[PDB]
Amino acid sequence: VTAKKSTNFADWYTQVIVRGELVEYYDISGCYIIRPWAYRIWEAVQKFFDDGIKRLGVENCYFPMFVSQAKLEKEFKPEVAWVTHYGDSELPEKVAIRPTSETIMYPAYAKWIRSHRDLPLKLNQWNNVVRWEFKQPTPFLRTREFLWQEGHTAHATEEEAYTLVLEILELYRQWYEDYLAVPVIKGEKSENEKFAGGKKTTTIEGIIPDTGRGIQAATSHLLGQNFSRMFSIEFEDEKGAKQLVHQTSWGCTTRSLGVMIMTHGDDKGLVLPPRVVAVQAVIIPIIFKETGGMEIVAKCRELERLLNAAGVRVKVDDRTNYTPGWKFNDWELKGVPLRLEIGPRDVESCQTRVVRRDTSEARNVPWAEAASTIPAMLETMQKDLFNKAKAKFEASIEQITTFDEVMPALNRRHVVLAPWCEDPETETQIKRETQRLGAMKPLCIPFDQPPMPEGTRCFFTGRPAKRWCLFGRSY
Amino acid sequence: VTAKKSTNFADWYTQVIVRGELVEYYDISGCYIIRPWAYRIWEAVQKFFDDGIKRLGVENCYFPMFVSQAKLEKEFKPEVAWVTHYGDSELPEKVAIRPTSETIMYPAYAKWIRSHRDLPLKLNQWNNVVRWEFKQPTPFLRTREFLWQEGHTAHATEEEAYTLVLEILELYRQWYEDYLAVPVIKGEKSENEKFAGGKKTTTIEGIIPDTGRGIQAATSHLLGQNFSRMFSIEFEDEKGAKQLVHQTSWGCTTRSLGVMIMTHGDDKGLVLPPRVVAVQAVIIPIIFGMEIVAKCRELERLLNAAGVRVKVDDRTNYTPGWKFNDWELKGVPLRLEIGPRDVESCQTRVVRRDTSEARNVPWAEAASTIPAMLETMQKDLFNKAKAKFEASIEQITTFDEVMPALNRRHVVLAPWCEDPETETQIKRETQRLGAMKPLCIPFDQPPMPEGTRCFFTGRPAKRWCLFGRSY
Ligand SMILES: Nc1ncnc2c1ncn2[C@@H]1O[C@H](COP(=O)(O)OP(=O)(O)NP(=O)(O)O)[C@@H](O)[C@H]1O
Ligand SMILES: Nc1ncnc2c1ncn2[C@@H]1O[C@H](COP(=O)(O)OP(=O)(O)NP(=O)(O)O)[C@@H](O)[C@H]1O
Ligand SMILES: O=C(C[C@H]1NCCC[C@@H]1O)Cn1cnc2cc(Br)c(Cl)cc2c1=O
Ligand SMILES: O=C(C[C@H]1NCCC[C@@H]1O)Cn1cnc2cc(Br)c(Cl)cc2c1=O
Ligand SMILES: [Mg+2]
Ligand SMILES: [Mg+2]
Incomplete structure (x- = not known):
């Protein structure tokens, strides 16, 4: 390998993945041939995950990859790919290639779910998705077509929906820690960083080791009752009263393979768990030279x-x-x-x-x-990879208390963990002042919360802090 | 159910699969929501088949679903779906959505395979595929988008290629017979019915039981050196001499699920293995x-x-x-x-x-x-099924016997010269008296008395072939 992981990271990556027979490069910008050697690892974590969700009683299905203009809307436009012709002929109506399948499944859910006796409904699919990205294509991490798994469920109580969200997260932690030997932190996104339609996004965060930048590895949303209002998904309870279901959706892609590569590779090349x-x-x-x-x-x-x-x-x-x-x-x-x-x-x-x-x-x-x-x-070797990796990571997190501590930490390629008031308004402020001095968003409020003395001021406002939160530059 | 398998067959089916929670109907014409109840069965045979190919050394991969016009149009234009716009903006160049993946893979193979030391190459993928169909859409059997598996390989010798073709076929027979309880006959296709770019096409054929009409369940091609010429897939042999690979491809879709429904369901509804x-x-x-x-x-x-x-x-x-x-x-x-x-x-x-x-x-x-x-029950299903099937095949000897059998809802097995020129005739002549094509020359061949004339020409017959109306 020519480039070096600490000198020339971008070109290193490109090199290890091509020399390590993982991908092949391709004439459509943003799309890459996954080769046997890499594909098999996708098979590995997939079976794991698939078994895992089956145990939870999710069942797989398949909706269609094409969506209608009509159905695709509740008033991102650039990211959609549209099919317009069959051979030469136009279609009388243009159809979108799915970016997500929310607008395809929910109409069906409203039809299927009629009574308390239809719940829960726990589906999931293993499909491909297309999203014509403005941002730069990178193999595995951010591509224009990608394989993922995408799960959608619906429940009579939020309680039950929430429990599942948490289960799926723990399953993602395992996906990463137990199989990729990639360390990750469970947390709970901030309002401006969560999923828009969702009541709450929870998530596992990685930190590309040398770079000092965090990255989102998988998501697991409590959708609450919101999409249930939108697509009018109602059910008759035990009592007879019509009501709105409580929902979750979750997802994780071939990005996981990319984090895993960067997490372990060295200048001789790839190092796989x-x-x-x-x-x-x-x-x-x-x-x-001689025989024998x-x-x-x-x-x-x-x-x-x-x-x-x-x-x-x-x-x-x-x-x-x-x-x-x-x-x-x-x-x-x-x-x-x-x-x-x-x-x-x-x-x-x-x-x-x-x-x-x-x-x-x-x-x-x-x-x-x-x-x-x-x-x-x-x-031995698997635990070692995880453990070396887990430490580089642990190293990269400075627990701060004042805004003063941030730019030093940041300039050491580190991420910060600071007390916070969690007012969404501060998020775009924090993004801006940090870039001013490139930006630093909130990455997640972690589940494992270090103790918060009564008194503790928010690092950026002085208001009483609510919870430690990770902040840092990202991907 | 309102309709009846015997009386309004098309409506019945539509009924059983909707009332049976297999599919859900959808606002894009030709494309149906596969529901859990049906989807699981796809998982069932897929694991079987995947394990099977893995035992043969075939590793899975993923190529992209978009193709360049450049690559695609090397070498059914109406069948291709083209993406043209991202959001509002026309792409510099339109990109096709794959119907098969041959034009995407065989280029990479040319690059990857250079030395005898790079063979055999045995890849496969589990992907979706779009083909905008002229023919009418039916759930599972012929749809615009479909899930399938598609396998492509490359070998130093035909010998080794061919062996794998036959292995894959036997896996397909099992796909159908052991898990779906659907009977199927192996055989080799005729020239006009095989794969264009293929040297030879082998196949398992079913018979929709009431319909009297045959149907293709899975294909498995010996490609020979054809595509290796086309895409210059070459290798330096043991002796140092640049040469062309021998190849195979094969595939089987969610159509299998559809045969399976038709083969066992009754007027009360679905009946699953x-x-x-x-x-x-x-x-x-x-x-x-x-x-x-x-x-x-x-x-x-x-x-x-x-x-x-x-x-x-x-x-x-x-x-x-x-x-x-x-x-x-x-x-x-x-x-x-x-x-x-x-x-x-x-x-x-x-x-x-x-x-x-x-x-x-x-x-x-x-x-x-x-x-x-x-x-017991699984075997009983295969056994009734196999019996109906055996019953639908009359072994004839001259043209005289054909229209009776065809009008009896049956298929025929007749000795044939196998001249490709006759296929088109036979299709016309019968369509006249709707048509009848050659379905497959079966592997299990009843004996051929020396002297046997071809049922259509009086020329010496090569081999028993199946003929009948189709799907
Ligand atoms: N284009 C992509 N290629 C690969 N993985 C992706 C891609 N987009 C998103 N992912 C991953 O899939 C997870 C779920 O996707 P999702 O949260 O819907 O994306 P998003 O909201 O659009 N985030 P982002 O794509 O970064 O703007 C993300 O947290 C990523 O880990
Ligand atoms: N539209 C379809 N939907 C579902 N399964 C299909 C479809 N077309 C073909 N198949 C199945 O996949 C197998 C391989 O397809 P292929 O070799 O491409 O046949 P073909 O050229 O499409 N013949 P035909 O289906 O008459 O146009 C077929 O033998 C069928 O069993
Ligand atoms: O995709 C999502 C939210 C959730 N969808 C199901 C899988 C898990 C995921 O967190 C957010 N998202 C992301 N990208 C999109 C791109 C387009 Br184009 C559209 Cl229409 C919509 C979306 C869109 O809704
Ligand atoms: O699909 C084939 C050949 C083989 N490909 C792998 C799966 C098994 C199959 O027998 C034949 N075929 C069928 N339909 C096609 C439709 C279009 Br459009 C194109 Cl470009 C090409 C094709 C095309 O080549
Ligand atoms: Mg996005
Ligand atoms: Mg076809």
């Missing part, structure tokens, strides 16, 4: 077989006329956690020499212990 | 009822634990008989009644959706029996 990577261990024969290659190769496939059995996603790189060192590089680029060398002396000893991707430390593992050790090592 | 249905058994209490509801949960738990997809319909102010109907409509294979007497005996009364035979099952034997019952 073993829980979701495609090949966890790649066995590589080292053979000399066949035995080495043999013991490689034997060891492969033994590991497969033990559960390990193994793979032997046997490519002929292609020197081992070259291979070492190919797979390091691609982020494979363990490399397993086998040369003449490893055969005669009865071992493989095991090189770890994140730290580059080698170790001899006897074939006899491989099927316990290798699993052991990956499981 | 227990291996894929959402709820296999719905317990229903009958009250004149605290104990009753209690036993219903107790039995629900027991069955859940036995592997069975249970659900208890407990809805207050909603009389049992009503419920019986709701669930019959929705296709649930087993209805488990529990009224006062069933509680006092320690049993549930178990009613089959397909036949309506009732049976008493004691709770003590339930966790053995119910699985046993469903597993």
Whole structure:
């Protein structure tokens, strides 16, 4: 890799994802080919998430990707893509490609939900969405077409709706921490930063490590009764009284893959968490100029077989006329956690020499212990990636109390955690003065609240503070 | 249901799928909301198939749904949907919404595959696809947008390519036979009916049972070196000599769901195969009822634990008989009644959706029996189905025999010379006397007495082929 992650971040990223066989670049601006190597990780977290939501009793469906002008409105225009022709012929009416599916599902919900006996209704779909973005295209993080999951539910009490929102968030925390080994903070968006139609947005926030900029990784809204008013979704309660449902919607995209890449990669290339990577261990024969290659190769496939059995996603790189060192590089680029060398002396000893991707430390593992050790090592490695990552993160958060402390913190590539009065009016103020001195918005009010002494003034107004809140520059 | 499968077939279907909660009708013509009850079945066969391909080494990926006019129009113009405007602004260039993904993938393959060391390449995606259809829209069977799976691969030899084609087909047979309980015949297509760019097209064909009309369930093509020429997909072989890959593609859609409905449903409503249905058994209490509801949960738990997809319909102010109907409509294979007497005996009364035979099952034997019952039922569905199907195929020998069979609502199996020129004739000649095309030459070939004349030309026959009216 030419560019360096701390010198030339933009170009680094571009390089690791292309060299690491994750994406391919494409002739439509904003759209990128997800390749097997990356796609599989999307499969990994998806199954996890999908199981998770099934346990909660959500069921999947599929609405159509095309929407009508008529239905698409309750008085963003640029971001919509419109289909106008079939071959040469116009359509008598232009149809939008969905940016979201709210305006498609809610009309149906009003029809379907008639009585308390229809609730709850918990649907979700795995679809693609299009949003012609004004902002700059970046692979995974912000693209013009993207895969996501998008869930919409409806309930007889807010209570029940809210509980679900929280469950889905915890599921997102896991998506990220347990599988991507990416640390994230649960919080609750500020009024101007939440979802407009929603009563409340809760969210998990990441911090691109070197940059010092926060980023939204997934959302989970309590929609309250608001869309229920709009699309007139009513139900007869136990009593007989017509009433409005309480609703939630939530979502998380292939952006997750992008955060995960940036969270772990280094100048040698990608570094992928073993829980979701495609090949966890790649066995590589080292053979000399002289003969005897066949035995080495043999013991490689034997060891492969033994590991497969033990559960390990193994793979032997046997490519002929292609020197081992070259291979070492190919797979390091691609982020494979363990490399397993086998040369003449490893055969005669009865071992493989095991090189770890994140730290580059080698170790001899006897074939006899491989099927316990290798699993052991990956499981170490996954927690390590999370833990190193979790700390860089923890580091990047300064707990302040006055406005004076902000621009120093900011200029150290840090984010701040400060007492706040939470008046929405202050948000655009704070954005502006910070840019004045690039801007810094509220990122989220975290659930894990450090203690708030009676007295505590808001850092920006002096008014009594309500709650700690994260502020910082963003993406 | 008002309509009847035998009498007003089109209205019936529309009825069963709406009253059965599979789809919902939608203001864009040709596009229907797949509802949970139907969607789950798509999940069922999809996992099957996905696991199947994975065992064959096929990894999934995602290409984009938008294509350049440049790329697309290399090489049914009315079928393409074009995006032209973002908000109000015309894009510099219009972009097509994919109908298939061949023009998006085969370029990348040309780039990616360079050395014998890059083969085989086996990719697949689970995506949606839009084709603006001239022909009339029908739920699942032919729609404008549809979910499908589409697989593309590239190999050093035809040998290896072909093998995979056949593997994928066998997976499709199972897709249909083992999970949907729909019978299908494997076979190879004729030239005018195969895929244009394909060397050979193999296929599983169904027969909508009443209709007398055949239908394509899934395709699996040997592309050969065709597209490799077109897109210059080349590789330096073991010996150092630049060469063209051999390729395959294959695909199967939410149409499968539609055949499945047509193949089992009756005038009471939907009748769904227990291996894929959402709820296999719905317990229903009958009250004149605290104990009753209690036993219903107790039995629900027991069955859940036995592997069975249970659900208890407990809805207050909603009389049992009503419920019986709701669930019959929705296709649930087993209805488990529990009224006062069933509680006092320690049993549930178990009613089959397909036949309506009732049976008493004691709770003590339930966790053995119910699985046993469903597993029976699934086979019974395939077996009636397969029987109707076998019955619809008359093995003829001359043109004389054809119009009778066709008018009998049947399909025919006749020896053929396989000359492509005859296909168009046969279509006309029959459409005259609506038409009849060659559906597929089946893999399982009845024997060919030396001397056998072609039923249409008197030329020597190559092989038995299926012919009949279609969809
Ligand atoms: N274009 C995109 N590409 C990839 N992921 C996206 C994209 N837009 C949004 N997301 C992610 O999906 C989550 C839910 O989307 P949503 O909250 O509806 O977007 P939004 O409100 O438009 N935020 P933003 O797109 O940044 O203006 C966001 O929090 C992002 O993590
Ligand atoms: N519009 C559609 N909606 C749903 N499934 C379809 C549709 N068109 C085709 N399929 C299914 O997908 C399989 C592969 O499609 P394909 O090979 O493109 O056929 P085709 O060229 O579209 N033939 P035809 O459907 O008569 O136009 C078909 O054999 C059908 O089983
Ligand atoms: O998409 C949303 C809110 C929620 N929709 C369901 C998935 C989870 C998500 O938080 C906000 N949003 C974002 N982008 C949009 C782009 C267009 Br174009 C339109 Cl019409 C509408 C929207 C729009 O409503
Ligand atoms: O879709 C095919 C060939 C194969 N593609 C992958 C899935 C399985 C399928 O048999 C044939 N086909 C069908 N319909 C098409 C419609 C349009 Br519009 C275009 Cl451009 C091209 C096509 C086109 O190539
Ligand atoms: Mg946006
Ligand atoms: Mg077609």
